[PDB]
């Protein structure tokens, strides 16, 4: 989560029906857009951010939310326009001995700005004495490992989270949703629509 990945999506089409009609998502919440209306909207660009957090932290991924993840790992803007999707990944991101490859920023002197990624691993100086890269009192590692295990509770089990931020700026509309066509009938008075020409 402290190193949440991001991908740009532009100049393409996607059928969001497979998305919001899929039951494989534990959390599916859209702000500023109707989940069932995605195929009906075009956007200049989209950002797909991806990471893993435990269930109890899933609620922090939303505008106006605070907490360790919201403040130090991943922050959303209050005017965020887009959707948040999350689903348990216990079978994938948990291990018998504890999956410690997932970490979250536990120390930070300030909160992250919207869509800010902080990957600094510098020893956090909690006192006046500098740490000089040596752990000790007032000197703690800024990241904390989840150590996910299959026996952890739902709120502690891992969840893969994807945030889709749709941006409809003054640039030409590039990302859209493919509308299914209909069979063609000849020699009958009908209403036609060919690639938008009606």
């Amino acid at each position, epitope marked *: 989560v402290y190193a949440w990945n991001r991908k740009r999506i532009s100049n393409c089409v996607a059928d969001y029906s497979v998305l919001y009609n899929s039951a494989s998502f534990s959390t599916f919440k859209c702000y500023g857009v109707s989940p069932t209306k995605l195929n009906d909207l075009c956007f200049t660009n989209v950002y797909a951010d991806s990471f893993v957090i435990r269930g109890d932290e899933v609620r922090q991924i939303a505008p106006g939310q605070t907490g360790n993840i919201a403040d130090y790992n991943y922050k959303l803007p209050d005017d965020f326009t887009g959707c948040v999707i999350a689903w348990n990944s216990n079978n994938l991101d948990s291990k018998v001995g504890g999956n410690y490859n997932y970490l979250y920023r*536990l*120390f930070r002197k300030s909160n992250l700005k919207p869509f800010e990624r902080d990957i600094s691993t510098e020893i*956090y100086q*909690a*006192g006046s*004495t500098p740490c000089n890269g040596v*752990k*000790g*009192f*007032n000197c*703690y590692f800024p990241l*904390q490992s989840y150590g996910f295990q299959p026996t952890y509770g739902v709120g502690y089990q891992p969840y893969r989270v994807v945030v889709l931020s749709f941006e409809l700026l003054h640039a030409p509309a590039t990302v859209c949703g493919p509308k299914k066509s209909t069979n063609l009938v000849k020699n009958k008075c009908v209403n036609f629509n060919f690639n938008g020409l009606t």
Partner: antibody
Amino acid sequence: QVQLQQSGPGLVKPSETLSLTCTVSGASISNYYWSWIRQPPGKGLEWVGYIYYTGSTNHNPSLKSRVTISLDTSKNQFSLRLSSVTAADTAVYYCARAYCSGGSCFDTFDIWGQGTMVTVSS
Amino acid sequence: SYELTQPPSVSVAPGQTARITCGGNNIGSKSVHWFQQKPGQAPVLVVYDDSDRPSGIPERFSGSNSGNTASLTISRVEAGDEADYYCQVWDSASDSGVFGTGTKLTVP
């Protein structure tokens, strides 16, 4: 709820090595400073030393030459060894956890063990 | 060696305000913490960071640290407040915890 339990010899002969063990239950022994405090009869609390999960250890200057603090994360325990114990070492020994809020461990102790009485008598 | 001095005992009737003082050179520049210890019980943190109370500590307890003196104030002393109060600071020069001599609070 984190609990600390102290075990060791209730009676130790003079000049022998006193070995006390503190077991942590309900939470991992990692990411916390674990300290030993001794209360001699009729005297106030005296700090003996602390050990961090990374192996960093510090001890009271008056007891540095005789005190060794070790950590066993596999058993979620930490041990205090006092060499050449004397009658002055007869005391109640507690293990305590440094108070860590917001990830910053303060110089205070929030969780204490019930204490174990050690008597140095021949 | 850095030392902390506390009154040997303080007697305050129920409902009154008890003030326990902890003396030490430059203690005002250090974070002073107050622990409570009942007979036969382990010390319990009552005040930290010179004003802060751990969750569950009644509001009647309060801490202050000015100059070379720290003060623990117990408003409306109750029969349950009878105990030994210890002030603890951290000497960064020796990186060690220094405890006060302890004050026996009694409630006649």
